[PDB]
Design a protein around this nucleic acid. Structure first.
Lengths: 209, 236, 138, 208, 42, 175, 352, 17
RNA sequence: AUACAGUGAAACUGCGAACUCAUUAAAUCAGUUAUCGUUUAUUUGAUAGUCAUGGUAUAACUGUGGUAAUUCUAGAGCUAAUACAUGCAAAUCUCGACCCUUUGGAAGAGAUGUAUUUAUUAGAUGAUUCAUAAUAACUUUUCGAAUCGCAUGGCCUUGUGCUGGCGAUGGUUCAUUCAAAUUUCUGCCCUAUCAACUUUCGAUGGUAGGAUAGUGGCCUACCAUGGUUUCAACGGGUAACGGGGAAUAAGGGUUCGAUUCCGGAGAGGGAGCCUGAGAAACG
């Protein structure tokens, strides 16, 4: 059974293979979200703290958190909406799993190659101005325009730089739109006032006549 | 939603050899049976545009203004007492029915095109105690003259949507009939009566003293006796 | 007895105040039916409660106005009137009289016997087969 | 305030009475999050009588369950909400929570108009608790100095914020008077003196 | 009219919906009648 | 399901009308709202035109109006004591329009000692002997005037005067 | 998993209650405790409330009926909802004729009886008077319906015919039960008396008049329950009282008061489970399990929401209560008996 | 007893041919 | 382009997606009403005072894998909104004593969203318990622009303050238009070798309720008993691929063409359900 071990802070993840069922057998009879120390699995995994997160059957069927079975069952699942009957493997880890998904929570002393040692950055930076302020720790006085993340791509000799469009940003155009809406509602209130005024004086003229 | 060329109304006076499908009037101010689409008005009647693509080109180019404002829909319903302004030609048309019972244009001047007559189908008191009248084209006009009642005509300025003058329903007034077997007839009314197991019946006398009787909702007071507010086509 | 049924029979949205004694026994609401039909004095000072009454209920008279002779009055607050209209049969080459029976709701204000000419008017469907309500009794 | 709630032994911490009083002030503060954190701090204090009904106080602080909690807590015949012995301990907390709800600004929404229902729940309460609520309303307003200094206003004490506080107090008294009518308790130190002080301050600002 | 009175006819769909158990009850018939006779100390 | 069509109905002459049209959506009918006393559950039914109908399945409190004093207070609904249509509705406490139910008298009572200022149990302050006797037991008879299945609310008015006398004589006849 | 507190006995709530759901989803997104959760049966819920629940004798199907009025069948093999079938009216009481879910009889609120087959609804008939309780007798192929009137309606499903109803002295029958050993029929009338009938001779075997010393107010017999021996019989009366009778004698062996004052909706003898001589009596506040001989309180199950029905999986420790809330409550008592076959892994959760 | 009051295209159209 | 600014895959969002088989003569269809008895996506005309800008959760996208395998999948990592969630006392009026001073300024006294449910109180139309305006409440109760592109506006206060025009997409209620549902009367074969039919899915009404978009025996309680007719109710046959001036005609065929409505049901077969303004959906 392969072990798909992922460590979220680094973002770097790796799949290990263990032919010996004896080391695997500690994972047995435990459900998704239960927590295993790796010291039972192997000497190198001593100090590592693994949460069981997922798994797939030998037939490719996923493990569904919530059901207390080691066997496949037919459940009403959202299509992702009308629910559709689909087969899922249960949440309890059994012998008939081809891959078991494990998430590292605490790091052991002996480093693991390929996932603990290396790190991958996030693909996309924050677009919203408050998100940028939270990421860079900015005060209200500072501007996010010079502090936006700028990404450089080369196309031949020429170098091009692109930046995300700042959304929810205070602009003079936005201020003008808000002021224009306020002025429109005031103008309509005025117009209804002289509409009532001319109606009142017309009714008064007919009353006098 | 495809309307047949033979199923097109007689009011349009289309050529049957033109095409298989007639235009279907869009939703708007006038009902589908007594509407006249702008494509029919421009292409088959005014002959300005030869086919529907350049009809769409004209109504893109905003020369055609209907009732003051600009319409870009090809099948926009234009109906009775509608003023169509072609700004490139500076020619203004008023849509009136023919005596035979078909739509016809009338060349009108600018200060005549500035106003439009509408039949007050509803008088009611809206919210915040604001009186309103609902005319035959669907216009809602706030704060009318308190003398205005149902089935009276109001002269409406196109630029402001305001009632300048109004004509009261009364015997001995030149009315126009807008429905039924009597459609397209101009005449002053003899009287109004109630029909047992029926509706209000209006008895109208023509120029040749012939008497014809129609529904109350069919009539349209165009003016008092001897002074039509609008221009009228030749043939009376 | 106006209160014969198990539910309380009262005109909707009419409130007489128990605190203040009133000269009238009960506040009563009457509406002009229209079409030049006068509201009868039996409806004005009646104690009866009827939803379907054109003068003292929510039913309004609009549509056609008909006249007919009363045939049967067995059913409660309903009458069956007969209208005889002359018909032409081409194969017979002669006019032949035909009749149509119109079951009509009768208000308790009107008292009708068998053979009385009554004027009825159209209204919203009172029952499965009743669409007409009396408005004048001759 | 979250850290003060996460403290293990707030009672064993020093200045416990002053910290409790400041926690009640924070509960009387108008901000709902501040009220929630102050209620967490008082639950960390963990009086057994308050812990018996701690669910009801959290339900009252919650906006969605506010009316359902208030009706069941107020109606003693409807349900055995508060015991008579437990009423003495839990009454100041409910009074402070209702005061914090009533301190909310008027808004056309019914969720913020629920302050009217908060005022209308007061006929269910006994007269000393209504007097305590009026004392809380008159609190943060100074009138003893005015009634001591020969009924003369102080120019330094005169300020816009004093006028806002007096206006809020007068609005609370008006609502309480409307819901209580002839059963309203009128105490000369709790409600009567601040009203005369507010009228005198209004006269002084108008004369300015 | 609206089923307000019992109609003792044979309704076709419900007919032969299931079959009776021909073995009888758990107890013997004579014991059953004996228990019914002496039941509640009559 | 439930259809409100008339094609199954016999003609006036008595002819047996045979059906040739399937049941269609504009003739639809939904299941009745059996509405009991309980913690408030409301089921939101989408109707024709996108409008919403609120079914009340359990109602504990509702607004009840004292017409003579001109007030309306939110009171709990104790239980159904009488219903003109069915008696099994009274048996199973199904809230329904025109049902006579008992409400608690506490908010109206406190409003009375508040506003008139006299202990209940001058002439304008004096009220009816029957409602004064009802207040002693603490249960006021009231009639539900709001369709609970259609509206999601159980509103009513307190019975007063000859309507109250009629319903009390019907209650004494039933019991 | 957390156990509701009973003295020296652990009662676990596996599925149950403990706008609103919209805030609960936002809370559970952050909550790690609600991140991993145990759901025995998916969609083991009704939108507002659930009237009654029953478990098929085959053992792998559970049929329940709630409110739009619908019938839910849960397959224990797949641990999910098999199907949901809508009805024109709310269900008062229903029975399962077949071993599995295929054949069932539903007495609805609209004075009617509907026959649910596996393909769909099969037949709807209507009894003359509004019904309260339903029971089926196999060897006669007879269906007995207690109604508002004095007549107890009989419908022979073999011949397919309404038969002569049993005339009773007092109008109204709240519950009808049939002892499967003797064939006896017991009808609990609206008064204190219970009427005992023989279905073969179609005659009145006897009449039992209940008396309560503690309560002077009259009470209605609401529940009747027979045991597997045929000798004992339990009555549930609306004052909150359960009476245990030996059928030979005319006096109760024991009387148990729930103390809340509500009516008893269900009485269940726990004969199949290992600890025998226990009985469960259910009021809308609480369900109590106690020894029949001594009346010593063994366990208590108290949901926050009212109880409408309770069913016991035979030979196991679980109880399915149909309630007034959205989810039905499942209560596991390990000390009674083992967990069922289809959910054998719940013992590890209880240990955790 | 009832008047139709409808425009007739057959009556309006020329039929002399 | 030192925020983005051209064109734009994917994705999110929004709008649209309303042939076969069976034969009914007040049924259908054709007209004719009614909707003071109803629902509205759109169109058109009206309509709303009562923070220099909030918090997320994901797709596309990275990556690690499971399956013989599906538009199948699980674990870990990303960030957007006209997506989802959240959210802001002044001003206008009336009565204005008195002042001068007539237009006028003003001591002061007072007033003030919308929707839902119910109770109570006072402009249209032949006619209303209708419109509208109140009063006390009620709500798992709403709505009262945290949006977008073209212009760089006019002041002076050069504050980088004030606010500046054309347009998009929203949103409340009412009307209109588009439909639709019921409804009214008027009309179609042969036959007594077819005289009773209806309560045999309630038949005819009454009261109350449930239901529906709404009237209604549409359904349910309770209560009366009726309703249709030898003038043929009712029933049978009808080749009812029929008939309808429905339909343009027959621009000189003797009655003929051409067009339109057929009426219903199904989309392997029973049953239950869902989305929408509109379907008991060809999904």
């Amino acid at each position: 059974m392969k072990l798909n071990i992922s460590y979220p802070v680094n973002g770097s993840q790796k799949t290990f293979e263990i032919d010996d069922e004896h080391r695997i057998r500690v994972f047995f009879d435990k459900r998704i979200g239960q927590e295993v120390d790796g010291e039972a699995v192997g000497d190198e995994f001593k100090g590592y703290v693994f949460k069981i997160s997922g798994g797939n059957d030998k037939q490719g069927f996923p493990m569904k958190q919530g059901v207390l079975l080691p066997t496949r069952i037919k459940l009403l699942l959202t299509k992702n909406g009308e629910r559709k009957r689909k087969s899922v493997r249960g949440a309890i880890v059994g012998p008939d799993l081809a891959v078991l998904a494990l998430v590292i929570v605490k790091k052991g002393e002996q480093e693991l190659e390929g996932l603990t040692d290396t790190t991958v950055p996030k693909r996309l930076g924050p677009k919203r101005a408050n998100n940028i302020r939270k990421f860079f720790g900015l005060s209200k006085e500072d501007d996010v325009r010079d502090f936006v993340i700028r990404r450089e791509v080369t196309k031949g000799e020429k170098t091009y730089t692109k930046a995300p469009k700042i959304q929810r940003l205070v602009t003079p155009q936005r201020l003008q739109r808000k002021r224009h809406q306020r002025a429109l509602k005031v103008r309509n209130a005025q117009a209804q006032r002289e509409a009532a005024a001319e109606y009142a004086q017309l009714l008064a003229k007919r009353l006098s006549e | 939603k495809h309307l047949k060329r033979l199923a097109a109304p007689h009011h349009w006076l289309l050529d049957k050899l033109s095409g298989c499908y007639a235009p279907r009037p869009s939703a708007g101010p006038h009902k589908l049976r007594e509407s006249l689409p702008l494509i029919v008005f421009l292409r088959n009647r005014l002959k300005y545009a030869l086919n529907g693509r350049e009809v769409k080109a004209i109504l893109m180019q905003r020369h055609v203004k209907v009732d003051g404002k600009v319409r870009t829909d090809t099948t926009y319903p234009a109906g009775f007492m509608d003023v169509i302004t072609l700004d490139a030609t500076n020619e203004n048309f008023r849509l009136v029915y023919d005596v035979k019972g078909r739509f016809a244009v009338h060349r009108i001047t600018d200060e005549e095109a500035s106003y439009k007559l509408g039949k007050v189908k509803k008088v009611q008191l809206g919210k915040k105690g604001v009186p309103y009248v609902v005319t035959h084209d669907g216009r809602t006009i706030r704060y009318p003259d308190p003398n205005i009642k149902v089935n009276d005509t109001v002269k409406i300025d196109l630029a402001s949507g305001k009632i300048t003058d109004f004509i009261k329903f009364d015997a001995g007034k030149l009315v126009y009939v807008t429905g039924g077997r009597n459609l397209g007839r101009i005449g002053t009314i003899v009287h109004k009566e109630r029909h047992d197991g029926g509706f209000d019946l209006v008895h109208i006398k023509d120029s040749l003293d012939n008497t014809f009787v129609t529904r109350l909702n069919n009539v349209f007071v165009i003016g008092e006796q001897g002074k039509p507010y609008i221009s009228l086509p030749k043939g009376k | 007895t106006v209160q014969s049924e198990r539910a309380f029979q009262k005109q909707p949205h009419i409130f007489n105040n128990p605190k203040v004694k009133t000269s009238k026994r009960t506040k009563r609401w009457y509406k002009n039916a229209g079409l030049g039909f006068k509201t009868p004095k039996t409806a004005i000072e009646g104690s009866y409660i009827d939803k379907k009454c054109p003068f003292t209920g929510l039913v309004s008279i609009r549509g056609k106005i008909l006249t007919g002779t009363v045939v049967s009055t067995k059913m409660h607050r309903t009458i069956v009137i007969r209208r005889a209209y002359l018909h032409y049969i081409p194969k017979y080459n002669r006019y032949e009289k035909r009749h149509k029976n119109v079951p009509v709701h009768v208000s308790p204000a009107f008292r009708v016997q068998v053979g009385d000419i009554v004027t009825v008017g159209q209204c919203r469907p009172i029952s499965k087969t009743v669409r007409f309500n009396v408005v004048k009794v001759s | 305030l979250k850290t003060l709630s996460k403290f293990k032994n707030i009672k064993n911490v020093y200045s416990a009475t002053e910290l409790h009083d400041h926690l009640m002030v924070l509960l009387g503060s108008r901000n709902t999050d501040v009220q929630k954190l102050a209620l967490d701090a008082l639950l960390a204090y963990k009086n057994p009588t308050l812990n018996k009904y701690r669910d009801n106080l959290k339900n009252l602080l919650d906006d969605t369950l506010f009316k359902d909690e208030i009706t069941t807590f107020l109606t003693e015949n409807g349900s055995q909400s508060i015991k008579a012995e437990d009423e003495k301990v839990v009454m100041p907390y409910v009074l402070r929570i209702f005061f914090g709800r009533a301190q909310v600004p008027p808004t056309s929404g019914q969720k913020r108009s629920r302050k009217i229902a908060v005022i209308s729940v007061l006929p269910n309460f006994k007269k000393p608790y209504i007097n305590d609520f009026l004392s809380l309303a008159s609190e943060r307003l100074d009138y003893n100095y005015f009634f001591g200094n020969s009924h003369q206003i102080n120019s330094s004490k005169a300020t816009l914020k004093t006028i806002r506080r007096m206006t809020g107090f007068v609005n609370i008294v008006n609502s309480t008077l409307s819901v209580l009518r002839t059963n309203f308790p009128l105490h000369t130190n709790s409600v009567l003196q601040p009203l005369i002080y507010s009228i005198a301050m209004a006269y002084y600002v108008l004369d300015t | 009219s609206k089923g307000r009175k019992l109609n003792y006819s044979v309704q076709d769909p419900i007919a032969n919906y299931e079959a009776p158990i021909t073995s009888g009850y758990k107890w013997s018939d004579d014991q059953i009648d004996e228990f019914f006779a002496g039941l509640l100390g009559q | 399901g439930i259809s409100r069509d008339s094609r199954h109905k016999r003609s006036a002459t008595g002819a047996k009308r045979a059906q040739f049209r399937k049941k269609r959506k504009f003739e639809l009918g939904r299941q009745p709202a059996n509405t009991k006393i309980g913690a408030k559950r409301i089921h939101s039914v989408r109707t024709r035109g996108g409008n919403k109908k609120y079914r009340a399945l359990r109602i504990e409190t509702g607004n009840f109006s004292w017409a003579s004093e001109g007030i309306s207070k939110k009171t709990r609904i104790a239980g159904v004591v009488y219903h003109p249509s069915n008696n099994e509705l009274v048996r199973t406490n199904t809230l329904t329009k025109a049902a006579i139910v008992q409400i608690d008298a506490t908010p109206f009572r406190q409003w009375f000692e508040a506003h008139y200022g006299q202990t209940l149990g001058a002439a304008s302050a004096k009220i009816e002997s029957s409602v004064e006797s009802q207040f002693s037991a603490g249960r006021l008879y009231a009639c539900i005037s709001s369709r609970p299945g259609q509206s999601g609310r159980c509103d009513g008015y307190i019975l007063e005067g000859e309507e109250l006398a009629f319903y009390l004589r019907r209650l004494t006849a039933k019991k | 998993l957390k156990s509701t507190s009973a003295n020296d006995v652990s009662v676990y709530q596996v599925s149950g209650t403990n706008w609103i759901a919209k805030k609960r989803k936002r809370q559970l997104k952050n909550d790690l405790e609600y991140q991993n959760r145990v759901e025995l049966i998916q969609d083991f819920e009704f939108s507002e409330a659930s009237n009654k629940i029953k478990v098929s004798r085959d053992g792998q199907y559970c049929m329940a009926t709630g409110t739009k009025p619908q019938i839910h069948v849960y397959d224990f093999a797949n641990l999910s909802l098999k199907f949901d079938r809508h009805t024109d009216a709310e269900n008062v009481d229903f029975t399962i004729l077949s071993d599995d879910w295929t054949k069932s009889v539903h007495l609805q609120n609209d004075r009617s009886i509907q026959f649910q087959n596996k393909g769909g609804l099969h037949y709807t008939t209507r009894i003359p008077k509004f019904g309260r309780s339903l029971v089926y007798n196999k060897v006669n192929c007879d269906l007995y319906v207690g109604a508002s009137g004095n007549e107890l309606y009989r419908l022979n499903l073999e011949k397919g015919r309404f038969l002569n109803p049993f005339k009773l002295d007092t109008e109204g029958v709240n519950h009808v039960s049939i002892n499967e050993v003797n064939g006896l029929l017991a009808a609990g009338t609206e008064t204190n008396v219970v009427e005992f009938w023989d279905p073969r001779s179609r005659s009145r075997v006897s009449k039992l008049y209940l008396e309560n010393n503690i309560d002077n107010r009259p009470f209605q017999v609401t529940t009747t329950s027979f045991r597997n021996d045929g000798l004992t019989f339990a009555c549930g009366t609306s004052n909150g009282y359960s009476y245990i009778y030996d059928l030979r004698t005319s006096e109760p062996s024991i009387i148990k008061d729930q103390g809340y004052g509500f009516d008893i909706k269900k009485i269940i003898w726990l004969d199949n489970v290992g600890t025998e001589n226990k009985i469960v009596t259910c009021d809308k506040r609480i369900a109590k399990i106690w020894d029949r001989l001594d009346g010593k309180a063994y366990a208590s199950m108290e949901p926050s929401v009212d109880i409408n029905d309770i069913e016991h999986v035979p030979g196991t420790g679980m109880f399915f209560t149909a309630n007034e809330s959205i989810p039905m409550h499942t209560y596991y008592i390990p000390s009674l008996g083992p967990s069922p076959r289809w959910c054998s892994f719940l013992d590890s959760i209880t240990e955790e | 007893t009832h008047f139709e009051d409808r425009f007739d295209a057959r009556e309006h159209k020329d039929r002399s041919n």
